[PDB]
């Protein structure tokens, strides 16, 4: 079961 | 209840209780849990010295008077015991350890111009 | 019969240990109603910013900014030159400064005297 | 560094005798052998001292190991009080844990022994401060009573650890 | 505030676990957990408020003198080697926003799925206004309750934070 | 004591709220969309040549990935590092120090041959 | 020579090659955790061929290979002291770390930052050497202080946790009272002896040493 | 040990001081007395390279024992047999050390009886 | 944590194990005790005593130089 | 982390195993929504007991603010389903 | 994965030392609402677990059989030469 990893942004 | 006007320089700001942020109730839904505040609460004239990674101020099992007094005494009685054992030494019924060649004069460096003062082990 | 708790100031009295916490009366009882009734208006007042969902930016606490002013600029004008302050200016001020002055100035007048005497090892001492 | 050393491997040492947190009562049994290696250096042993450093990073780093591998299991727990029974739960570990304590204390012809045991020795046959001497004996017998504790409160009575793990 | 009969009840709590720390055998904590229990029955029946006051002050009292030193605290309770662990991990919603368009297009279901909410939310924002302020006093609240919704599509008062925090291993 | 009607309503609807918005935080099954990535020949060559067990062949590529290791990280720093040391550091003064080797009564010297006397004659007595 | 003197390096330089790996060479986040414990798997074996050499011969060797500075009389060199103490003891510190490492990949498996994890056991292992190795004060310093910091970023690993903080900020208190000794020795020994080279304090061997003494058995306190 | 009680809890001039061992001539005693020889000559200690601490009359079965380990690499489990002649040698030369120790003891023992007998007389 | 034997955790009920975890256990125990009574056998000495102590008080006054107390 | 997660089905079947297992509640009158107080008859303090064997059931405490709301176990069952994120 | 709960009715508190605490807990008139509870980690695997002197023995059986095996090998084979 995967679930959504909330992270700040890591383009920048 | 303000500080004294002593003339520190506290004006009028408030004197609250001298209380760790590591007290308050940890269970309630502050509004900074970390700092375990709340929202517009007038802070502690010493606020940053009372968080959670500093000078805590919360009741101990012991009494603070009589911790004191043990950690004071233990120490104590062990740096004069060391003293006592210092007078005292321990060692084995062996007499001077024996070395040739004058003792290993020139082995340390000694002065081979100046002849060492003859030094001899017999047997035994 | 226990050894009664002895509070210093790195140790607060337990609450379960405080008798304030037993004679509860009218007043007692009325009195900490009044502190969630304050303490329930600025909750109210934090929540509705809060959830804002049009609001980006900063909560500005009025709290902190008046904590901050009286730690820096409110307290010079609240100064008065008394007995107190006086005697712990000059102690903590001056007191360090006159007892190093001596603790340094007698270090280096002895190892002066010693080094023109020639009693000082400075066998290897080229770097200085 | 002779009465230093000595302090430092009964006081901690002494500590060690009433944790509960398993990985803490490691980091005291490290405290008390670092004790010993300084006792070592007081008594003009410093290949001795040396020595020890060397065997004791192979037991030492095998319990914290081992101590890990029964803290991952039951959860993130590492209080001693809520373990129990891992005797036959965890055979591997249960091996590991019991080698380590046997070099720790010392025992004939293990790691601990060619150097721990070859120490006390040169300590009591030495012209040394006589408090001193006594200390490091006396805290050689808590390693033992604290090395104890391990396995008694982990891996012998009855789990004490939650129903499901 | 507390009631009477809540510290009480705290107590009767408080001293198994210390109880339990010292005794750490199952049976053996077992057998005391009855004792103690003993000793809080019988005095169920005291109903004089100054006598009964009395027994709990001294009962406090006998805690304090008999707690563990180092009482066993759950892993993640305040104090217990867990707390606060996994608050690195633990990151606000609001920012996904600044997600750059090309990191959420590896995402799409869960960003379009995302402005349900965000949408929801702004909807129901000036009804949970309009909520809130007739069930106030004209003083403003006097406790920190709040109301639930009452009415078929209106959700609870200031209720995103609350259902959208980080979860308990958000990683 | 419990509850008072309202709380469990309002935990009732937030908890309702509460377990959808955990739903929602599932993927589906295409998420991630990974972007086109360019794979190497290698890369095709090892996923292919190992989708049987065959311990025989797999075992190649456990000395393969250590022969690759231990030629990047082991043989070539020790080519610069010894050719480092032989025509720059060697060749200044005192930079490599050697503790001269310990000589015993009864060997023979390679630069020279000399023979060093053997000790005199021990009482021996074996205890 | 030529052997003992390269293989010796070679240990040292093979740690740093995944912490400079790091930098966008070679893309392996997921396997990167086995590329650090493989390194030292062949680092220990390197190590085990000098410690040979000097159990065999009692081979022991300086290598100044390069001039870093020169303080007027002052020559300060980047020195490895291949000898009893650091021959021995890499060896120990790499199989103990071996063991570590490969633990460490089951441990911290569910960890999201097990990638920055690995880097920072890493960088421990190479400042432990330069402690072990070095040859003059300075450079043992360097590593002195080295390990100090990882420690610190290692402890509060969890900078989430509270508790995590004030205990690492608590080593780094200890450990700089510490070094108030080793600022200590080192002033000691080159305002008496001119020189922070252990070669050199030796040979002249200071009488009076109290003071250097008293500042190193506060350091290791 | 126990000579220790008899000196902290005892006469201490009847006990010896090792901080100024000895306190008799050598040649008291022991007439045309011999000495020790050093069967492995400075040069050879030299050569061989050893701790000053084990530059003592029991070496040059030291050094036999070092060339042993020298040459019977790899194989350390051999050369056992150097090790106990080194050790059974070291073992000697302590308990000679010890014969001093006690020999001490008994001269200035004879001293006090001897002083008594001198000084009561007087 | 994953990878390896995967095993299904039993509630209120002792833990699955394996052949081959029990078996290394006990191999290494068993090697540990033979390695005890290997060393004891060969290196007693090393635990109880090298060589015999010398007792002071049989040593005789003519090996010692001890003059007789007439002089 | 190697710990397998919790259904909702799976909290509600431990909930009332470990009631089951208590002595002064009979099992037929023990229901998913069988309040302690006014269904099975039990004091205050019998309440708190509850608790505790549940705390060690699922090794997390419960603040005793949270824990004196408890009173039936369907409601213990949301109050840890929610507390550790359980939806499915 | 629905995990079979083992049937709660087996947990009984008879024949182990939470008996014990029956026994005496009746002796004052009281008892034990939760033995059932803590009944099974006496019951199963967890019962009858080695005493300390007994972990110290691990192995020790096979580990003397390989001693004497292996001595008796060294006395004969060192007896040649
Ligand atoms: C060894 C020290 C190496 C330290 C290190 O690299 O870790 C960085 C590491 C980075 O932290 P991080 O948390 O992993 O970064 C995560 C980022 O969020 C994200 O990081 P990332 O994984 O996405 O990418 C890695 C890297 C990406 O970096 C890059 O892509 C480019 C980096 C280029 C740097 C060099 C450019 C300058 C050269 C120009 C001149 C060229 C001339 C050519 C002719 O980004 C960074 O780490 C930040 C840039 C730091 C640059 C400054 C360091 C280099 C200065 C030289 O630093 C630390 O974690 C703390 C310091 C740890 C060391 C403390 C103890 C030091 C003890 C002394 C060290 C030994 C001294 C010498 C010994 C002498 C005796 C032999
Ligand atoms: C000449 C020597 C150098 C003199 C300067 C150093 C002397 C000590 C003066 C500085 C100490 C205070 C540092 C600034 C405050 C930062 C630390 C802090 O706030 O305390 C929180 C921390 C408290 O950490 P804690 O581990 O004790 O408890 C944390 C709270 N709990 C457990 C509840 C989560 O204090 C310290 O870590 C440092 C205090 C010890 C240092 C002082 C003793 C020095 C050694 C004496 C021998
Ligand atoms: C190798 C060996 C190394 C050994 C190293 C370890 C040495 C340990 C030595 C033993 C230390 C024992 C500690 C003794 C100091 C105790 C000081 C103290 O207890 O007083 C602090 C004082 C508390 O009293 P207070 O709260 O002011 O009274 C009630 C007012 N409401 O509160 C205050 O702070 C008031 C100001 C006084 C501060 C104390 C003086 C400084
Ligand atoms: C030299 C140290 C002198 C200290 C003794 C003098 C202070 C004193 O005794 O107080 C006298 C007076 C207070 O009298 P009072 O009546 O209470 O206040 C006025 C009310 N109308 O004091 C006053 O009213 C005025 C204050 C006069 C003294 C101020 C100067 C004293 C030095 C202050 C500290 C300087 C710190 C400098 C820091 C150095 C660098 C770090
Ligand atoms: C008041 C400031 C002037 C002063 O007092 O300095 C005088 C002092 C020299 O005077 P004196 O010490 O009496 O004579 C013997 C000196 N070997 O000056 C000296 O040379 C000795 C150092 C003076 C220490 C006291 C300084 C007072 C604090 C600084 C001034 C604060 C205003
Ligand atoms: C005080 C002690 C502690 C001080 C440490 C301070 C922190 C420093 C951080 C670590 C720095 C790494 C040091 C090792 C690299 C040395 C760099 C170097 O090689 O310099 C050139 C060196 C010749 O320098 P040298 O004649 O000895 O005098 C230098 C005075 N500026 O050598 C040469 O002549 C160059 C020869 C190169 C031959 C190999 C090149 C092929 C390999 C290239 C790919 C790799
Ligand atoms: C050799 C080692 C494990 C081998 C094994 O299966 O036992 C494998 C695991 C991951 C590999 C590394 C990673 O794939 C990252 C790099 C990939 C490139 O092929 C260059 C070498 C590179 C640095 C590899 C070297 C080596 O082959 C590694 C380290
Ligand atoms: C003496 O040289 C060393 C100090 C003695 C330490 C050992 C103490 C134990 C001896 C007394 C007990 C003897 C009877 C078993």
Redesign the pocket.
């Known amino acids: 079961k995967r679930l959504f990893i909330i992270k700040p942004s890591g383009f920048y | 209840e303000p500080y004294p006007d002593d003339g520190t320089g506290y004006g009028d700001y408030p004197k609250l209780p001298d209380r760790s942020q590591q007290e308050r109730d940890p269970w309630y839904d502050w509004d900074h849990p970390d700092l375990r505040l709340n929202w517009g609460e007038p802070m502690h004239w010493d606020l940053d010295m009372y968080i959670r990674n500093r000078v805590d101020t919360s009741p101990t099992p012991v009494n603070w008077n009589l911790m004191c007094k043990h950690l004071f005494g233990f120490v104590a009685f062990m740096l004069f015991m060391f003293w006592v054992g210092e007078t005292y030494p321990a060692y084995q019924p062996v007499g001077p350890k024996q070395y040739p060649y004058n003792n290993l004069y020139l082995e340390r460096g000694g002065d081979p111009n100046k002849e060492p003062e003859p030094v001899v082990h017999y047997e035994i | 019969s226990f050894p009664k708790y002895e509070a210093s100031r790195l140790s607060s009295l337990p609450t379960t240990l405080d008798p304030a916490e037993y004679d509860i009366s009218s007043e007692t009882r009325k009195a900490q109603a009044e502190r969630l009734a304050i303490r329930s208006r600025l909750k109210r007042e934090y929540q509705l910013q809060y959830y804002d969902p049009s609001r980006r930016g900063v909560i500005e606490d009025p709290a902190l900014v008046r904590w901050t002013y009286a730690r820096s600029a409110n307290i010079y004008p609240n100064f008065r030159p008394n007995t107190k302050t006086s005697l712990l200016g000059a102690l903590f001020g001056i007191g360090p400064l006159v007892f190093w002055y001596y603790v340094f100035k007698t270090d280096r007048d002895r190892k002066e005297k010693l080094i023109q005497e020639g009693k000082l090892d400075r066998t290897f001492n080229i770097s200085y | 560094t002779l009465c230093l050393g000595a302090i430092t491997t009964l006081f901690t040492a002494m500590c060690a005798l009433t944790q509960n947190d398993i990985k803490k009562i490691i980091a005291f049994s490290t405290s008390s052998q670092l004790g010993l290696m300084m006792v070592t250096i007081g008594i003009n042993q410093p290949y001795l001292a040396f020595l020890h450093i060397c065997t004791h990073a192979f037991f030492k780093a095998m319990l914290f190991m081992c101590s890990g591998s029964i803290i991952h299991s039951l959860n993130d727990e590492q209080d001693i009080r809520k373990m129990g029974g891992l005797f036959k739960a965890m055979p591997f570990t249960t091996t590991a844990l019991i080698v380590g304590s046997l070099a720790l204390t010392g025992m004939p012809f293990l790691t601990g022994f060619y150097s721990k045991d070859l120490i006390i020795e040169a300590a009591n046959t030495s012209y040394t401060n006589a408090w001193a001497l006594l200390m490091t004996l006396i805290a050689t017998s808590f390693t033992a009573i604290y090395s104890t504790r391990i396995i008694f409160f982990a891996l012998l009575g009855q789990p004490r650890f939650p129903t499901l793990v | 505030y507390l009631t009477h009969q809540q510290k009480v009840l705290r107590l009767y709590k408080r001293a198994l676990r210390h109880l339990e720390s010292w005794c750490i055998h199952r049976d053996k904590y077992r057998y005391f957990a009855c004792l103690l229990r003993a000793r809080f029955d019988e005095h169920k029946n005291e109903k004089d408020m100054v006598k009964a006051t009395q027994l709990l002050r001294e009962a406090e009292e006998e805690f304090w003198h008999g707690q563990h030193p180092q009482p066993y605290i759950f892993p993640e309770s305040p104090g217990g080697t867990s707390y606060e662990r996994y608050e690195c991990y633990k990151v606000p919603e609001w920012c996904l926003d600044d997600w750059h368009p090309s990191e959420k297009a590896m995402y799409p279901d869960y960003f379009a799925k995302r402005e349900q909410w965000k949408k929801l939310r702004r909807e129901s924002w000036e009804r949970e206004v309009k909520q809130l302020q007739e069930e106030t006093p004209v003083g403003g609240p006097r406790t920190e309750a709040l109301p639930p919704a009452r009415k078929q599509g209106d959700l609870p008062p200031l209720w995103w934070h609350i259902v959208t925090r980080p979860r308990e291993r958000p990683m | 004591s419990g509850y008072t009607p309202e709380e469990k309503l309002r935990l009732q609807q937030l908890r309702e709220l509460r377990r959808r918005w955990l739903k929602d935080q599932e993927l589906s099954p295409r998420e991630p969309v990974l972007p086109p990535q360019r794979v190497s020949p290698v890369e095709r060559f090892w996923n292919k040549f190992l989708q049987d067990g065959a311990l025989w062949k797999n075992v190649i590529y456990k000395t393969y990935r250590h022969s690759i290791f231990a030629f990047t990280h082991v043989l070539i720093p020790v080519w610069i590092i010894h050719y480092y040391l032989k025509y720059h550091v060697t060749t200044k003064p005192y930079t490599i120090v050697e503790k001269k080797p310990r000589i015993f009564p009864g060997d023979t010297i390679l630069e020279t041959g000399e023979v060093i006397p053997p000790m005199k004659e021990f009482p021996d007595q074996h205890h | 020579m030529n052997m003992f003197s390269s293989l010796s390096l070679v240990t040292?330089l093979l740690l740093?090659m995944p912490?400079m790996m790091?930098?966008?060479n070679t893309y392996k986040p997921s396997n990167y955790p086995l590329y650090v414990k493989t390194a030292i798997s062949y680092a220990f074996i390197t190590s085990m061929i000098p410690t040979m050499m000097f159990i065999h011969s009692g081979q022991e060797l300086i290598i100044s290979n390069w001039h870093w500075l020169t303080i007027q009389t002052l020559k300060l060199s980047?020195s490895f002291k291949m000898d009893y103490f650091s021959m021995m003891f890499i060896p120990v510190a790499l199989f103990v770390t071996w063991s570590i490492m490969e633990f460490s990949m089951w441990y911290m498996y569910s960890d999201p930052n097990i990638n920055?994890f690995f880097?920072?056991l890493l960088?421990f292992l190479?400042?432990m050497l330069?402690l072990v190795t070095a040859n003059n004060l300075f450079?043992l310093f360097?590593?002195w202080?080295?390990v100090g910091?990882?420690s610190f970023?290692l402890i509060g690993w969890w900078y989430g946790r509270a508790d995590a903080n004030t205990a690492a900020l608590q080593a780094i208190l200890y450990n700089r009272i510490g070094d108030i000794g080793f600022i200590l020795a080192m002033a000691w020994f080159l305002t008496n002896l001119n020189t922070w080279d252990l070669q050199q304090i030796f040979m002249l061997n200071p009488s009076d040493s109290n003071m250097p003494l008293i500042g190193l058995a506060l350091a290791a306190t | 040990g126990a000579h220790l009680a008899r000196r902290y809890l005892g006469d201490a001039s009847v006990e010896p001081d090792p901080l100024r061992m000895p306190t008799f001539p050598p040649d008291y005693g022991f007439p045309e007395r011999k000495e020790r020889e050093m069967v492995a000559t400075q040069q050879e200690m030299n050569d061989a390279q050893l701790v000053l601490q084990q530059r003592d009359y029991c070496a040059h079965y030291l050094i036999r024992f070092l060339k042993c380990k020298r040459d019977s690499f790899p194989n350390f489990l051999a050369c056992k047999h150097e090790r106990h002649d080194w050790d059974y040698c070291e073992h000697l030369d302590y308990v000679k050390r010890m014969k001093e120790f006690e020999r001490e003891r008994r001269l200035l023992q004879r001293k006090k009886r001897r002083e008594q007998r001198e000084a009561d007389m007087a | 944590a994953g990878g390896g034997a995967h095993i299904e955790p039993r509630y209120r009920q002792f833990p699955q194990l394996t052949r081959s975890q029990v078996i290394q256990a006990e191999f290494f125990s068993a090697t540990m005790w033979f390695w005890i009574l290997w060393r004891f056998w060969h290196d007693s000495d090393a635990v109880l005593g090298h060589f015999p102590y010398p007792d002071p008080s049989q040593w005789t006054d003519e090996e010692l130089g001890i003059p007789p107390d007439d002089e | 982390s190697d710990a397998p997660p919790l259904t909702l089905e799976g909290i509600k079947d431990r909930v009332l195993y470990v009631l089951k297992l208590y002595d002064k509640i009979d099992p037929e009158k023990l229901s998913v929504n069988s309040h302690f107080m006014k269904d099975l008859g039990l004091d205050s303090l019998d309440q708190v007991e509850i608790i505790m064997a549940m705390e060690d059931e699922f090794g997390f405490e419960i603040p005793d603010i949270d824990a004196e709301k408890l009173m039936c176990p369907q409601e213990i069952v949301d109050y840890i389903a929610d507390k550790k994120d359980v939806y499915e | 994965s629905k995990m079979e709960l083992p049937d709660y009715k087996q947990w009984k508190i008879e024949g182990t030392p939470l008996e014990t605490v029956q026994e005496k807990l009746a002796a004052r008139g009281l008892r034990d609402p939760w033995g059932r509870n803590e009944a099974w980690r006496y019951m199963g695997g967890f019962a009858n677990n080695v005493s300390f002197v007994g972990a110290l023995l691990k192995g020790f059986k096979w580990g003397f059989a390989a001693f004497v095996v292996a001595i008796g090998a060294e006395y004969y084979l060192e007896s040649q030469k």
């Open positions: 040292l740093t912490i790091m930098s966008f980047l920055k880097k920072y960088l190479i400042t330069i450079q360097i590593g202080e080295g910091i990882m970023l």
